[PDB]
Design a protein around this ligand. Sequence first.
Ligand SMILES: [Mg+2]
Length: 214
Amino acid sequence: SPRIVQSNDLTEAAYSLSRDQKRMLYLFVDQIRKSHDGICEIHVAKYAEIFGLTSAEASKDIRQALKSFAGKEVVFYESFPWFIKPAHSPSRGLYSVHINPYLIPFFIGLQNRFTQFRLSETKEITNPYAMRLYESLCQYRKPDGSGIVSLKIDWIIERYQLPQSYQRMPDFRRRFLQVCVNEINSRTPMRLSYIEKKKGRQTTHIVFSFRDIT
DNA sequence: CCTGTGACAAATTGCCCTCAG
DNA sequence: CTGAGGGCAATTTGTCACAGG
Ligand SMILES: [Mg+2]
């Protein structure tokens, strides 16, 4: 699929979006790059095509995901509103959106540091936290297509804005870690495992090690 | 403290059914 | 045929109360 290239800033940005909302942002960056005012646009047939949905169901996703963008902010470690104006359909099947102009810079490398991947790697993932992990792991991918990275549990909870109940490690393992690891080792070209780093009686970081299936 | 696990309810998800250009 | 709406049941995800170390 098209190859996405977002800055690590966003990749590490703290926010809470849905699958459909994230799928939507991918396309927003893409189209933006190969294009700023932020005034992007989305088509239902294309969307329905890329992600394999019926024209109808793709309409549900875009329409609901566009409302759920109201009031949501992005915190680049400076908080920013995703949109500055309500989305709107000028033509049947087409939606026009005004991404906060002030956000293009971040959505664009602006420097050597950045993250990239193809839509095929992340189009089969369902859990938005898993989409988050994958992208982060891709921030450490080497030309080989593998890597190893240690992440602070703290950082993960704060950036991925995980549910409060995942502050209790036994629940973070079950609902977040195990879940996202499997999802990736099944819906993406990545094959990964992990080791828990400890500080006596408590897990502090998570050591992720991954290698490309191909 | 810190773990793992069973219940439970709110969310999601892929389908299904209509209807107006 | 599209795509804008209205629903639905089966999973999932987010909480929490317990036993044990
Ligand atoms: Mg959907």
